[PDB]
Ligand binder design. Structure first.
Ligand SMILES: [Mg+2]
Ligand SMILES: [Mg+2]
Ligand SMILES: [Mg+2]
Ligand SMILES: [Mg+2]
Ligand SMILES: [Mg+2]
Ligand SMILES: [Mg+2]
Ligand SMILES: [Mg+2]
Ligand SMILES: [Mg+2]
Ligand SMILES: [Mg+2]
Ligand SMILES: [Mg+2]
Ligand SMILES: [Mg+2]
Ligand SMILES: [Mg+2]
Ligand SMILES: [Mg+2]
Ligand SMILES: [Mg+2]
Ligand SMILES: [Mg+2]
Ligand SMILES: [Mg+2]
Ligand SMILES: [Mg+2]
Ligand SMILES: [Mg+2]
Ligand SMILES: [Mg+2]
Ligand SMILES: [Mg+2]
Ligand SMILES: [Mg+2]
Ligand SMILES: [Mg+2]
Ligand SMILES: [Mg+2]
Ligand SMILES: [Mg+2]
Ligand SMILES: [Mg+2]
Ligand SMILES: [Mg+2]
Ligand SMILES: [Mg+2]
Ligand SMILES: [Mg+2]
Ligand SMILES: [Mg+2]
Ligand SMILES: [Mg+2]
Ligand SMILES: [Mg+2]
Ligand SMILES: [Mg+2]
Ligand SMILES: [Mg+2]
Ligand SMILES: [Mg+2]
Ligand SMILES: [Mg+2]
Ligand SMILES: [Mg+2]
Ligand SMILES: [Mg+2]
Ligand SMILES: [Mg+2]
Ligand SMILES: [Mg+2]
Ligand SMILES: [Mg+2]
Ligand SMILES: [Mg+2]
Ligand SMILES: [Mg+2]
Ligand SMILES: [Mg+2]
Ligand SMILES: [Mg+2]
Ligand SMILES: [Mg+2]
Ligand SMILES: [Mg+2]
Ligand SMILES: [Mg+2]
Ligand SMILES: [Mg+2]
Ligand SMILES: [Mg+2]
Ligand SMILES: [Mg+2]
Ligand SMILES: [Mg+2]
Ligand SMILES: [Mg+2]
Ligand SMILES: [Mg+2]
Ligand SMILES: [Mg+2]
Ligand SMILES: [Mg+2]
Ligand SMILES: [Mg+2]
Ligand SMILES: [Mg+2]
Ligand SMILES: [Mg+2]
Ligand SMILES: [Mg+2]
Ligand SMILES: [Mg+2]
Ligand SMILES: [Mg+2]
Ligand SMILES: [Mg+2]
Ligand SMILES: [Mg+2]
Ligand SMILES: [Mg+2]
Ligand SMILES: [Mg+2]
Ligand SMILES: [Mg+2]
Ligand SMILES: [Mg+2]
Ligand SMILES: [Mg+2]
Ligand SMILES: [Mg+2]
Ligand SMILES: [Mg+2]
Ligand SMILES: [Mg+2]
Ligand SMILES: [Mg+2]
Ligand SMILES: [Mg+2]
Ligand SMILES: [Mg+2]
Ligand SMILES: [Mg+2]
Ligand SMILES: [Mg+2]
Ligand SMILES: [Mg+2]
Ligand SMILES: [Mg+2]
Ligand SMILES: [Mg+2]
Ligand SMILES: [Mg+2]
Ligand SMILES: [Mg+2]
Ligand SMILES: [Mg+2]
Ligand SMILES: [Mg+2]
Ligand SMILES: [Mg+2]
Ligand SMILES: [Mg+2]
Ligand SMILES: [Mg+2]
Ligand SMILES: [Mg+2]
Ligand SMILES: [Mg+2]
Ligand SMILES: [Mg+2]
Ligand SMILES: [Mg+2]
Ligand SMILES: [Mg+2]
Ligand SMILES: [Mg+2]
Ligand SMILES: [Mg+2]
Ligand SMILES: [Mg+2]
Ligand SMILES: [Mg+2]
Ligand SMILES: [Mg+2]
Ligand SMILES: [Mg+2]
Ligand SMILES: [Mg+2]
Ligand SMILES: [Mg+2]
Lengths: 221, 121, 116, 203, 48
RNA sequence: AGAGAAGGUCACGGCGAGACGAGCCGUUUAUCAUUACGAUAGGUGUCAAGUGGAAGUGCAGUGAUGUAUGCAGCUGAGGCAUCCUAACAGACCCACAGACUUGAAC
RNA sequence: UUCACAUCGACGGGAAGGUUUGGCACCUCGAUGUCGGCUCUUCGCCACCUGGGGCUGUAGUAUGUUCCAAGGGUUGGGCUGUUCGCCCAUUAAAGCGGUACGUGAGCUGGGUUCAGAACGUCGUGAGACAGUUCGGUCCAUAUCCGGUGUGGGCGUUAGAGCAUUGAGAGGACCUUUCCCUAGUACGAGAGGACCGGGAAGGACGCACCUCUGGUGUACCAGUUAUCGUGCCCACGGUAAACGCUGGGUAGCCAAGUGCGGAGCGGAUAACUGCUGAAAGCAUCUAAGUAGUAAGCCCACCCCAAGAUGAGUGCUCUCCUA
RNA sequence: UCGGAGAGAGGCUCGGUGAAAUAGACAUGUCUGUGAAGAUGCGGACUACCUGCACCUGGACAGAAAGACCCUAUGAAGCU
RNA sequence: AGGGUGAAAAGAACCCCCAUCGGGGAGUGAAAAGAACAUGAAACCGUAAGCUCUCAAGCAGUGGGAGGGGGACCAGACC
């Protein structure tokens, strides 16, 4: 999964409504930023086997970081950071450890992004809610209701299948929302407004990459 | 949000007092008629001695819902009843005069209907 | 689930839990320190502070609001006397919670909630 | 933490005493290389001439074993894989035992030049199954050989090795590389003897 | 649903040992707590 | 054997994480003086938001009731401030320069 | 119309399948039980639609028949115990089969017509019916396997903290109208395209709470009965787990809001081909190659080194006597 | 349609007390084949570290004894 | 349904743990046989010591026996 261009990380601040001159209201997620988006490490095909660049994000007090990690950011000559991530490119010549990224130079207006984040955890969920199972009959005689139904066939095969859909834990995962649009960038507040929803509640951690379009940005295979 | 077995009031001359919706059309497998959708209805109550007999199967377009229509202005519109207007398969209303308000959202597919209206919203 | 549901249930229905809390705070204001379960304590904080903050203002309005919470009048009047004296400078935070050895009967975690 | 307290000191010392005395009176090991019928010491021991010889721990020790290299270019898959299986198993040593690993290591190089007769390049079918229903997957030999060509020879030799504990432990002795180069030069690989006539194909 | 067979001795010993291991973690909490009340410096804790 | 490596678990305050374990965030709460990193929860103060005009006392009315004081009073699961309470005291695990062989280098 | 082989194909023959009605009695009788729906799958292909083709008695549109193709799809009602089937209105189409009626330690109707009763009929009669009718009890705390999730231990050859490669595994790659092309080819007209662009929809999936709302026993207001707070005032309790109503923030949620389904990538099935022999002609094939499918494989999206084949990378720590 | 949210009693964790039906022994995978003709236990492949907990109910021809249905018995009884 | 401390209750003074029960010493006794008391099998429940299991598919054994341990006198054997 080679990624087109460098992305940055940001924090979801929550959604508001945003007018256009002709009175079109677009709901937008407001993505704020914090001190960070600093290139931490760079990995060459020779040395690491592939091409990638590791950016750090959130600043942090020194104590809170562990000795191995602190040593990792001292080798870079960068400030202490909470989250590290990797972007995977096809060409890494433009990047030097300790370099800084500015989201104003990587993202214009009317551009397409891709937002990865973690989803809201809904806990341990039933068949209905997790898979959209239809619920059985509520009244005439029936004792089923929200129950799972039958889980397999008879004597043959005589065991349930793998992957057969069941109640378990729902949400709380890396999710990617493809092809969003950037409505407005505010320099004063250093914020980006994006049309539509992105995963997770305010105070989340997001990853924005320029959109991967399977024909034209990526290796053919 | 008209769906089968829903009862409707008719908005025009056409001489039907009440319609029961049996089908939504052109929406593929949708279950919801909303404003501007063509539904197959049947006539339940008729205005006596009119070209329309009860128990007729007819086409009509939904011009009013109790559900809410959302324009791009952020504007929303909600009526107090459901109503449709009985048409031909050409888009021409069978009855020649229409009651009640309508929306500018019908202007694309039905001209006649927006024309005959007493008010436009 | 609950996300952002902040209330203390105390494993009682609404009615009982209200009455419970009224009771426990009249006890706390009457004796000045008491022994309960950690849950009941942590829950009781809010309403203790409500009464104290109430009596700092003293108006017939406020006093009527306290009378309609606490069970015993005498305690309320005592409050509206004492508090401007004892708490005048303390901006919030009027309770100490000092936890103890668990209960023998059920092994319920105990605690000591003090009027500070 | 390794305690240097007089206690652990004492214990280790004592254990090397036990080991010393156990080593002195035990019968020496005489490896099998020009190993004549008996040493004057074994002669006092158990009866190893009138029972079937079974290998002891000093024999099969991993560090000893031969290494071999098979250049697989223009070899025929199966016929080579049988040879390989024989050597890995140990069936070509006088010391062979079914219950033990006496075998060699075998290094297969140029695993993308391996040759197969007739239409097999397009016909032979490598199937593997998820374990869900409808979970069957199929490759032709050629798709496989372009994608991950080592798996072809691994999959052909593993077929001819015993199955079960010794089988798997054996299978780790087969080292396969797609290029013409192997990073085993330190192990000093000998070349593999091939006594088959038909194993070498010519175009 | 019933137990088609009777549970074998050794497996049962493993399950009950699992239930006995919770005693190990309880003994750790208890020890740490004792060493905390054994200095008389804790203002969050009280004993009588 | 003393000690307690890096780190971990526990404890303690928590959560948009959670059946339990798990995950994540905190644990003296900074300094600043030009950025950002040192407020976890509760409380308190203010703000958004909700509800819809408090009690008391005046006036009008035979009275039920209306009207003035007053976008009031109550609430505030959301923000932002401020260490006022509780993050005290602490405990446990954990530290043979990494068996053996073979080349290469020096 | 001519013409056996576009499409039908009589008289007969040769098969496959194992879904119909059967034969057998190998099977279980103690409590291994038939048909419909609900929920939930899954697989086959003899293909109903959607992708690509050959032939036509194919002008065009639409067919007919057949080839490859099972990735996806296959509605909602009136009627029945029903398999079957009929109709209504749609639809791209409303496929046929297997899975012990697929599924009763998941649910529910009939059926084993259990005991009551009545009708017709047979019987002198007690009673009877592969006649009809009304009424009529199936339980269940999961030991093991199987499954969906989620931990600990131990391994990973010193111990750790981070960041990742991706073997393998899954999810998803679906479909309809309409508009340009152009009223252009085609046809005397009536009718009316292939190919490639553009929008709107459907179903399904992934999120989300700005708007519209639902709930919201955190809260706020009215209000009935009544008992408390000494009485008026004003509040508190009760009217199960809100006394009854009217609103509602955060949460959760959909009917609300976004987004998705991309590939002049790779290799093929049918088929169309180019060079071209064996048979100095011909031939898409024997050598060698070119186009080409909703199919196959990579790409897309999550997981993933217990991938014991236990990967690679950066940093940290190994004191004292 | 097409489900949503909430309250209580359980479920879940911790402390106290503490059963039951069941049970040849069980070190108790999947596919396919075989076989008294539907196998964890026989064959061949394939897949699988050890062990908990919460949930689910396809299998173990799951569990609760004579099969009510059919037949047998020179059985039993009621009735004509 | 519930029998057998000893020959004799000599049925355990005194001290310690100590609210009682229960126990450990001392003392009685041939023996503690200590009152739930005489021989005390099996299931079943454990505790300690020796070897050993966390890539594994199995009516659990058997023939072969790697490595490790133990009591020997025919030390080449036995467990
Ligand atoms: Mg971290
Ligand atoms: Mg959650
Ligand atoms: Mg339903
Ligand atoms: Mg019910
Ligand atoms: Mg309870
Ligand atoms: Mg009540
Ligand atoms: Mg408050
Ligand atoms: Mg340390
Ligand atoms: Mg933890
Ligand atoms: Mg905690
Ligand atoms: Mg501390
Ligand atoms: Mg705070
Ligand atoms: Mg806060
Ligand atoms: Mg007033
Ligand atoms: Mg009021
Ligand atoms: Mg007056
Ligand atoms: Mg307001
Ligand atoms: Mg401060
Ligand atoms: Mg403090
Ligand atoms: Mg070394
Ligand atoms: Mg050495
Ligand atoms: Mg013919
Ligand atoms: Mg028979
Ligand atoms: Mg049974
Ligand atoms: Mg076919
Ligand atoms: Mg087609
Ligand atoms: Mg055709
Ligand atoms: Mg024609
Ligand atoms: Mg298909
Ligand atoms: Mg399929
Ligand atoms: Mg299908
Ligand atoms: Mg079509
Ligand atoms: Mg069925
Ligand atoms: Mg089916
Ligand atoms: Mg069943
Ligand atoms: Mg019946
Ligand atoms: Mg008669
Ligand atoms: Mg009845
Ligand atoms: Mg179990
Ligand atoms: Mg299991
Ligand atoms: Mg696990
Ligand atoms: Mg694990
Ligand atoms: Mg480990
Ligand atoms: Mg380790
Ligand atoms: Mg990754
Ligand atoms: Mg892959
Ligand atoms: Mg695997
Ligand atoms: Mg795939
Ligand atoms: Mg595609
Ligand atoms: Mg023309
Ligand atoms: Mg097109
Ligand atoms: Mg679309
Ligand atoms: Mg909303
Ligand atoms: Mg909101
Ligand atoms: Mg409401
Ligand atoms: Mg709401
Ligand atoms: Mg009174
Ligand atoms: Mg009241
Ligand atoms: Mg009362
Ligand atoms: Mg009552
Ligand atoms: Mg009550
Ligand atoms: Mg209400
Ligand atoms: Mg939508
Ligand atoms: Mg081709
Ligand atoms: Mg041709
Ligand atoms: Mg020629
Ligand atoms: Mg030619
Ligand atoms: Mg060829
Ligand atoms: Mg192609
Ligand atoms: Mg394709
Ligand atoms: Mg497509
Ligand atoms: Mg690893
Ligand atoms: Mg290895
Ligand atoms: Mg619910
Ligand atoms: Mg509930
Ligand atoms: Mg109860
Ligand atoms: Mg318990
Ligand atoms: Mg019993
Ligand atoms: Mg096993
Ligand atoms: Mg057979
Ligand atoms: Mg079988
Ligand atoms: Mg088997
Ligand atoms: Mg066996
Ligand atoms: Mg055999
Ligand atoms: Mg089951
Ligand atoms: Mg169940
Ligand atoms: Mg089975
Ligand atoms: Mg069996
Ligand atoms: Mg007879
Ligand atoms: Mg007789
Ligand atoms: Mg004594
Ligand atoms: Mg006493
Ligand atoms: Mg005593
Ligand atoms: Mg004595
Ligand atoms: Mg004596
Ligand atoms: Mg005895
Ligand atoms: Mg393996
Ligand atoms: Mg092992
Ligand atoms: Mg085994």
């Amino acid at each position: 999964s080679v990624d087109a261009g460098i992305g940055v990380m940001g924090t979801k601040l929550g959604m508001m409504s945003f007018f256009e001159e002709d009175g079109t209201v677009v709901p937008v997620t407001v993505i704020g930023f914090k001190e960070g988006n600093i290139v931490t490490q760079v990995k060459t095909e020779s040395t690491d086997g592939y091409n990638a660049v590791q950016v750090g994000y959130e600043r942090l007090r020194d104590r809170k970081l562990t000795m191995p990690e602190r040593g990792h950011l001292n080798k870079a000559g960068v400030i202490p950071m909470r989250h590290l991530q990797e972007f995977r490119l096809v060409s890494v010549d433009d990047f030097t450890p300790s370099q800084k990224l500015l989201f104003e130079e990587l993202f214009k207006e009317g551009d397409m992004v891709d937002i990865s984040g973690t989803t809201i955890g809904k806990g341990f969920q039933g068949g209905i809610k997790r898979h959209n199972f239809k619920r059985g009959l509520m009244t005439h005689g029936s004792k089923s209701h929200r129950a799972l139904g039958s889980i397999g066939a008879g004597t043959t095969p005589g065991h349930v299948y793998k992957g057969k859909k069941m109640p378990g834990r729902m949400g709380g995962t890396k999710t990617k929302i493809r092809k969003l649009k950037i409505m407005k960038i505010d320099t004063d507040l250093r914020v980006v407004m994006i049309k539509g929803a992105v995963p997770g509640k305010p105070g989340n951690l997001l990853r924005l990459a320029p959109a991967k379009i399977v024909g034209k940005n990526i290796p053919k295979n | 949000m008209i769906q089968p077995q829903t009862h409707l009031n008719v908005a025009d001359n056409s001489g039907a007092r009440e319609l029961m919706c049996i089908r939504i059309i052109g929406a593929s497998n949708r279950r919801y008629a909303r404003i501007g959708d063509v539904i197959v209805a049947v006539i339940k109550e008729a205005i006596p001695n009119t070209p329309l007999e009860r128990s007729e199967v007819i086409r009509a377009v939904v011009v009013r819902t109790c559900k809410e229509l959302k324009r791009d202005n952020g504007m929303i519109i909600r009526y107090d009843d459901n109503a449709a207007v009985i048409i031909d398969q050409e888009g021409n209303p069978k009855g020649t005069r229409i009651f009640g308000a309508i929306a500018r959202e019908l202007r694309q597919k039905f001209a006649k209907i927006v024309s005959l209206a007493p008010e436009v919203l | 689930m609950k996300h952002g549901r902040k209330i203390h249930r105390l494993s009682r229905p609404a009615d009982q839990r209200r009455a419970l809390l009224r009771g426990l705070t009249t006890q706390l204001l009457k004796h000045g320190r008491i022994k309960t379960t950690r849950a009941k304590a942590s829950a009781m904080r809010k309403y203790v502070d409500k009464m104290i903050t109430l009596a700092k203002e003293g108006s017939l309005h406020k006093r009527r609001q306290a009378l309609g919470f606490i069970y015993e009048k005498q305690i309320v009047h005592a409050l509206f006397a004492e508090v401007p004296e004892r708490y005048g400078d303390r901006n919030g935070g009027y309770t100490r919670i000092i936890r103890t050895l668990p209960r023998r009967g059920d092994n319920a975690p105990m605690a000591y909630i003090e009027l500070v | 933490r390794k305690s240097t307290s007089a206690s652990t000191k004492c214990t280790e010392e004592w254990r090397q005493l036990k080991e010393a005395v156990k080593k002195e009176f035990a019968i020496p090991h005489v490896p099998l290389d020009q190993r004549w019928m008996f040493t004057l010491e074994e002669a006092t021991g158990p009866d190893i001439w009138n029972t079937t010889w079974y290998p002891k721990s000093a024999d099969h020790v991993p560090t000893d074993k031969k290494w071999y290299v098979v250049d697989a270019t223009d070899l025929i898959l199966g016929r080579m894989a049988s040879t390989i299986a024989i050597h890995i198993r140990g069936k070509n040593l006088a010391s062979y035992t079914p219950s033990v690993d006496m075998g060699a290591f075998v290094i297969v190089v140029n695993a993308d030049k391996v040759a197969v007769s007739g239409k097999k390049r397009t016909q032979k079918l490598y199937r593997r199954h998820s374990g869900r229903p409808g979970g069957l997957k199929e490759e032709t030999f050629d798709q496989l050989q372009k994608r991950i060509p080592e798996r072809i020879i691994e999959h052909a030799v593993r077929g001819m090795l015993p199955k079960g504990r010794l089988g798997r432990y054996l299978f780790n002795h087969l080292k396969v590389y797609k290029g013409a180069e192997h990073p085993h030069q330190a192990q000093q690989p000998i070349d593999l003897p091939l006594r088959d006539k038909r194993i070498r194909v010519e175009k | 649903a019933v137990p088609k067979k009777r549970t074998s001795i050794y497996k049962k010993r493993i399950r009950k040992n699992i239930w006995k291991k919770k005693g190990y973690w309880a003994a750790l909490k208890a020890f740490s707590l004792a060493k905390s009340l054994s200095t008389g410096n804790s203002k969050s804790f009280f004993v009588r």
